[model samples]
Target chain A: HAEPLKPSDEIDMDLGHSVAAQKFKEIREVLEGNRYWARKVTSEEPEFMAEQVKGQAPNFLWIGCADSRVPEVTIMARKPGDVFVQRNVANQFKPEDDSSQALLNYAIMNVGVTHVMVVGHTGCGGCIAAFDQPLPNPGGTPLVRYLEPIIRLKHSLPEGSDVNDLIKENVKMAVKNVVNSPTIQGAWEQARKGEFREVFVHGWLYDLSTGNIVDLNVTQGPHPF
Target chain B: FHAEPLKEIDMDLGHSVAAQKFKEIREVLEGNRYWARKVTSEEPEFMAEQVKGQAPNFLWIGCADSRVPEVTIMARKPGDVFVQRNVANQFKPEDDSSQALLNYAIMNVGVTHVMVVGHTGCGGCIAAFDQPLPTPGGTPLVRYLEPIIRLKHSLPEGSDVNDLIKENVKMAVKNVVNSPTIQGAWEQARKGEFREVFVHGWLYDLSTGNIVDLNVTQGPHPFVD
Candidate 1:
């Protein structure tokens, strides 16, 4: 009796009347969208899916926000295997966050990505929240706790600063965090010694009002000692 | 310990390699222009609508694998799914990053569904399956995947990597279900103060470009301790 829920399952809830029904409808749309996508891709490139199974060797590692508006692959017009990604609230790379660190290690050590980008966007909710106020009480929700550092960063800014300033500053700091990571630093060391291909880290800010991504021009790579 | 100067270094890589690298970056930037133009031409109000803010109904917690671009594979547009992707999609209860994302998605954004997705051919799972269990005080990736390595031992002997992958998804689902934010949302759901929020475990097959629901959907009540 542990059969998975199929798309064909009848709506057992009040159709169109209750919130569950509306949400389930949305889920159904997603499933149907997958089916449509599969068929289209299969028709266009019969070898595409089979090629993916061989394993991925993407050239880029994208660290971006969890904001829905910044769909990295779609906006870049890139294929599935072109970029590996790690996204979280406000595109942070906290010093103690093992999750992003592990992703960075794997992307550099295992995948051998040559480029790593820290992407932020205009009108980020997390950045806006961080810019709005001081850190919440210690007993507040995890999000408030998570925003503490960002809040502190905002507080460090000059008065009359806007969310866009906070967003770009956040991206710049995140890029520095990536550059400082042991995996990236080690990769750069090897690159300088001609053992590994050079990896470049960049900072970018995506504009939501116009789907353009502007490079903040803060790129780092291996340098002579 | 000093702030590294923000200078674009002239790398020692031969001219061809540097030229090729710059070419790839140019292509990405050009691709963005094309995509934005095409999207705006197709739906003139798309970007304008997006700037208003996002209210995504689905929250996706998935692996940061290059081959498993969630939005692309799901054939969904940007803003349809809020995303938090890391290595292996693990949602350890102590992970404040993912917890913050969850809290914001459910409590603030009011997303109706959360999907914890694992994929076949997961490098993290493969490492856990093949490598000896990691000891304390290893690299960040080693420490991050340590729990998964320990989990492999608890499974039946000779189980394949996919088994561990699915199990990881199950563990993540349980973690999400047991989260205080999720629990609070579920309580509100039970009290009819909010809509029911569903947590699902899914597996994406890169070879077939399909997502299979693992039949482990939970709402309100705890599915596992």
Candidate 2:
């Protein structure tokens, strides 16, 4: 028998924070801070990048894929210099590799961004090529191999799915990489001991057509994924 | 998390007609595809061996369209990519630049299936039609698709989207067929190490949501230009 619907049982599902009871937390407050929001730095507004070079800025250091179709600020309607950006194929976070790893290290260690977002898009050529063997090797070797760390997620996916799915999972794996890695993890451990472990690691996929970003359902709070 | 689960768990969750129809739909259409895929009988047998290991066929090379989702079409769960896709079902002949992204797909985790999927009524394709951007410059997608623009020169006059989009997919097919990575896999198949990879191109119609596997493998369409 079906249970009768209860009007009082309904809970606010906004970002899982139960808005009806719990107030929007301090993290949400920080996300809405001055440095985080209210900027219009498109490629046209190149001065914002200059402003960041001049001052303390940026809430997150983003490590993402090199797919041109996935424009970072355009979809988000965020201005330039808002996100400290790093991009490569497959969005890999290799501590040994300099490309993304260096960017991440600099962002967290030097740039002092409070958050890290390793993003993958709906259409990533690298993740797609990774799934299909016999990649398009114009020369001898193929691309999308620079970050070997990201492949661990590709092997873990359910069998018989496609490139679209691979890219989505790659984002999650990259986030986990940030969480598991010594570089960010050590800093986080210190934060954990402090009163508030504020920093978070998240994975997101940007859907071009919809222009809406989808969260991977795994967000590393103080609890971590 | 709340009383929501309490009220829902004790209630009847499954519906009569909709749930029955879902099961029936799963039972049917178990073998309708362009590839040598049989998911219905194989998934259990494959999962049974997971205590040991697992292997899956059908790596879908797909488009980046959010609506043209691979797992929903195939009705799958986590861990299905062998790797899959985006943008006109494209793989350039000279595309393999040994980048981090592509190398991950080819050299790293090897996927058995590679399917190139295009779709009708694509916003990318429609936008690729090339009207001046509403701005003084244009929309942001200008530079990324610069490669596909060259095809415009080869297009026979009156090469509108209806004619050009599908043609672009076929043109991309030749590039994929000539790609070193996929070609090497074919050679490996000749050596009897791996099965001859079946490279297929398809177009998903947004209106009907039906995927049409291009009967013409890698050339001009018979009737149209």
Candidate 3:
């Protein structure tokens, strides 16, 4: 007769079952965490939430990757209402992407953010995937199609480029895209004429290994006319 | 008399402004260093563990509003929730950016819970609600929000921004459920070949700093029923 399977051995035999169980537990934890967070915030600062509702006047607009490891507020040690955020796979800010364009418009014209930061991260899965191989046909899937731009960026680089180089290049491209946006240009023009406060755009990279951000020193401000 | 020729704008002011912005960016970087030290002090192995990989079970689709930082409000740590946030928490069928994110979350990350969260006093919803007659060749923000504008028109008269906000969340949930990626995931789960994935619609109240479930959830047939 075969010996009884141990609990760990059983989990390995049916990984799907283990994953499913873990998923449900995490779902419950999320809800419970939300409850506790709400109560804690209320206890610490009675007026914090109410003040948030009045309106938001954020100083920074952050465009970042959707990777789970780089939670923007957590890493920056900032609170809610400090940064208006737009995140997606690899943090691409294509000029032709209406979603990104819309976000830039609202952040600049509506929210009046003073600074815009395009943040790239080390070990970005999207960047690694884009760098490792050619994506499936552009028409194969939405993800493949969306990443075509990144793949194109990779191919444009010299043969010896690594993933970190590609990631930083991607950030620079996104910052350039934002700087070239008609909305951003118009805002800069307004600032030059004193109709609006100056807005600056910067590019930065986050190191997953250290949880620290490195300024890329690629900052652009109002056009000096 | 003709006004004296305007003095050439002090171009140096632009450089000065850029310097100040760089200082602000440095501050954020310093904040990151402090935050990382604190986390490491609490859990000496935290950074090392995160470096290995991430297997987040939750995928959050939320608005890019400054006041609604999902991870912060949920009291969750890094590597807990994969996120994709855009204006108004939109999930349009034709938006490859969001579709790609959904596909990756379901197929690659194997997230079991997908949350589409909208917030009260959303500027995107307000823009859609108050936009005038639509015209061709409008700004990208206008075109991106055209769907919400149409939804606004379809609603009963006297509907306010809050109503539109909630309705938008419901529409996003349905859109996610109907996506081919999600549908395929649900189909596999129905056959017991894969883990089930649940899509939920939620409303985050900025005034209260709390998330309220809207009860709009869909999943594999057995689970949803």
Candidate 4:
């Protein structure tokens, strides 16, 4: 007998009265996609399903945008198990953004990733929204509060700057913010004390139109701390 | 010591083309040119259509483990996933980055599903189990992961790293359900102009390369009359 699947709260008991048929089918494609990929991977590497015995020790970390078009691995032409990743809207980095920071510590100090990239993209909705929309009032919405500083970052831009340019600027700002993190600084200090190479943080932009990853050319580190 | 904030340096050079940084710059820029050409050759209108806009169906919050390429693992493409990731994919209410992305994805991009995906053998999960904080000054990561540490401490004795990892994923799912931006969008969803949104939890197994749906799910369907 097969082990029973873990009980889940995901099932809608009244599935008969669920959303329109098209909606259900639209979501169905995700499963199809999963099966298709499993087949593709296994066809090439028949033993790939055996999984890894020792686990992963990736050397790179990717901090990227939450945009659908900017999926981290595909844009870089990388496969699974190649890089660690962290993402959020606007690809913004902040000092108090603890979730990302904690992950950073785990990546650089624990996993020993030497390279980290903060990636932004052209046609970023967060960047555009930060510029054109009214942000939520303090405490009214944490999402707006999170993006507020990135929104305020625009004041530093050249007057009448294009939104795309601002997007690039955001990427640069992210590089600076990430490098400033204590987690990264600690990595540099650790490197100085021993054999570890200093971690390098980079800023990059993806041109959605072209499917190309552009280095915004703001790269920092391997520092003395 | 907190290094005194440094002034931004200027390095627009007329003669440093032979430097390593300069050489790498050339490589990346040219790399983009070639990559774009290759993409356009395959899909003639890919760039043009991309410029129109994005409509990702799902928002994914995932761990930064190198092994789990969010979109690639799912056999999906860039335009299919709106992603926000962090170490172990934890969520915090005060997190501006995550909240902003949710606002953009939910309000602007109109994603219907939000997911928090965890993986077995996560470094963050492993670290959260028992590692000491890196510094006395409270590193950014330490502050970010403080909650997890406390949660780990509070769990029954002998709670393993995997247990902490699962709890973290579950907590992040709760974070999304209670998030103000999501809550607000849920209100919009109640108006019938949009479908209710759902949050899903998943666990990815590296050995088997299978994503087990740990579906402690939540959704807003207030107006299902």
Candidate 5:
């Protein structure tokens, strides 16, 4: 990523030092990975890349963890064009999160997606960090602050609740937040006014080990306006 | 300043999705049991080992387009990259979500690289390339995409959506480097609290599955320390 540019921090933007030179090499590796992936995809679907240029028309918006194991495509067994997605540390879905909002707005209003799935996974790093002690700096960053809510929720659960259960609860909370978001409300308003279509909100848990997505069945579909 | 949250005060849980509550619990437990048996048979200590903690090396900001699966497509493992995704992967100066993530990713998470990934044939980019979006009341989505629209206009005539897509990554990289939150973290890095951090711009082609470097780089640096 940006590591490829460290050597150029000094005057003349020189990649002279060994550290910086290594970055240049690492940068090339990133490019190489992309080339391999392109080749791999095309080997299976020859028209893949060419068809993408036509424009994206997705049906689902997935809000999930940044965890690699719960990859939307691999777990859902769906291709890329099928789901619009926004992922963060713990699959947070705060109504005002611009990162999520921008994607939600575009997915719902602009791209015309009909389903929004908030998926949390087993063995999530963020939830694991937040499980026992509070995050290092509770009020330090927006992510930490968002995680702060998890502590209270954890305390409220039964004594036997595992961190994984908290992870599922996090998904449920986000699902509620999604339903109450302005984007969803606005969509409902428009649909009532006969301007837009209905969009469903679903909550799911992706098991890292089994690679199964457990539908929490926490679905809030289009409500009567 | 951060914009006011777009969600209402928390509503009573029952008022929202009462019907799905108990059923969701059953499904969650059933799903876990099924997944646990499947996973434990393969690697018994996998879940046990995952609880330790996370120390990722990279932070990713990219489009929520499903075609651009962050982890799998980048060939990264579960704990390698921290991430946040949005439409066009653009950053807003006032976006609390991005700000908090930056604060956490650099300060708490101590990642060395921050990448902004844009893609070919982006619907958000295509929308921004078109003037006069159907933005009712300059919705957060519209406001989020405004900078890209401005970037679109600055380009010479005959620029296609691809040009705008590439520029969006460049603009997002610059915004992250220049953001106050990120700047504060850079100051910490300057004081040797942690190592340097680098911000990068990358373009992912959906059709090709390739992640191309846009050559817009900053850091591998802390300030003029």
Candidate 6:
């Protein structure tokens, strides 16, 4: 598995860097480990598959897009206690949207979390809608149309940046939305005042190309990878 | 975009409709987008269902994203998608851990469709792009999710997420193409024993209730549904 594998015969494009080069580096770390498939998605359930639904603490509160891709915790190789994810059309964090904020409060205050990673993906149809002002979906539009709050993030970006760049800024804004929220802010104050630790926020973008990710300048800090 | 063959050659006992329709619905929503153009030669699901006597389309290898249900959205009953999931829709290429499960689905049970559906907004793909994930603390899933990250670095910096999704799906198709088990099943089809056998790659979307069929590499009639 660590050996440099060839690219698929189908795809005819190039993204500048060799995927093998990137994969070669990743292979070094993953192959070094003992087990191959990593899945931290399970909590402490017995062998009974039915017993597996006993409810878990890590019900990821993912505030994400309604994109066809972008599943929450499972996509991260996470198990039960990993995340209580909340997803929307474009991963928008609407201040007025109680649905997502409700989950945010619980994940941060009650359920407890190390951090809330505000994940974003490039070429998001929602983002594109936000960028291009798309027509509403035929029937009921989701929490998406009501997501102008998050949509505002696109306005602050450099004009001419492609979808990738647009996605990056959106991630940062999503993280900031989480980071500046009352739940996060209250926790932030506590951590700053030595009262309690604030949940760290990470903003990231999942690139659809090459099956690799690009850091939209995220960090444990307020930067992109 | 389409799923692979449904039955696993001589090992098949019955079919999986719930899994097959669920996967098909998901496939329509993810990559190709415009629902107006979405057309299966037959009612794609019907093709798999006809095989229920022998080949069930109840097959899956997915990320544990809530958006990706084996049945619900696909508008099917229960027991359709005979699934084995992971963070991203990866076969891991090397680890045959899913081999027995696949063997059970195809060889013994006779399920036809062997789908590896990777949807949009996958957290695992993003996570892979983020960090190498430390080993000792990380479990087997960490390694399983690692390859997708490496795959990401293969594209251009300015690539679109939709385009990248296509690349990932294509790569997955190729990987499935290389599966010995699938190849063996193909041999059965070659002999004109029952019907055509296929291997498919797909993307599922969480938002507008769509599934995209990306693998036009196959044929229009897709003798191998």
- Every candidate's DockQ is 0.42, 0.04, 0.32, 0.35, 0.24, 0.02
Q: Compared with the true structure, what per-residue lDDT tens digits does model 5 show for residues A1-225? A: 555533224312322222332465555444545456666778888887777767678777889876534556544445567778887767887766555777787788777788788888766666766677553334664555667766667777788877777887888988999999888988878887888886778787665544445666677766632
Per-residue CA lDDT of model 4 for A77-127, tens digit only, reads: 666766878777778777665566777777876777777888887777777
Query: Per-residue lDDT of A130-205 in model 3, one digit per residue for the tens?
Result: 8866744245667778888788889899988778778888999999999999888998898889998888888877
The per-model lDDT (C-alpha) reads: 0.82, 0.47, 0.81, 0.69, 0.68, 0.47
By summed lDDT, which 10 consecutive residues of candidate 5 chain A come out lowest? Answer: A11-20
User: By lDDT, highest first, what's the ranking?
Assistant: 1, 3, 4, 5, 2, 6
Q: What CAPRI-style quality would you assign to candidate 3?
A: acceptable
Off by over 4 Å in 4: A1-23, A46-53, A133-143, A189-194, A223-225, B1-35, B131-142, B150-160, B187-193, B221-225
Please rank every candidate by TM-score, starting with the best.
1, 3, 4, 5, 2, 6
Cα error, candidate 5, residue B138 (Å):
2.7
Q: Give the 10-residue window scoring lowest on summed lDDT in candidate 4 chain A.
A: A7-16
Answer with 1 or 6, whichever has the higher DockQ. Answer: 1
lDDT (Cα, tens digit) per residue for candidate 1, span B1-225: 001112222212232232345778778877887899899999999887888778888999999999888898888898889998889898889877888899898877768889999999999999888667755646787788887888888899889999999999999999999999888888898989889899988888787777777768789755442
**Candidate 3, superposed: residue stretches over 4 Å from native:** A1-25, A135-139, A223-225, B1-23, B132-137, B222-225
**Sort by DockQ, best first: what order?**
1, 4, 3, 5, 2, 6
lDDT of 2: 0.47
Q: After superposition, how far is residue B136 of candidate 6 from its true place, in Å?
A: 50
Which residue ranges in model 2 land beyond 4 Å of their true spot?
A: A1-145, A148-201, A204-225, B1-54, B76-80, B93-112, B131-140, B191-193, B218-225
Candidate 4 C-alpha lDDT tens digits along B43-122: 88877776778778888888777777878887886688888777768777776666667777887778888878898887
| Best by the DockQ measure | 1
Of the pair 1 and 6, which is ahead by TM-score? 1
Error of model 6, residue B169, in angstroms: 33
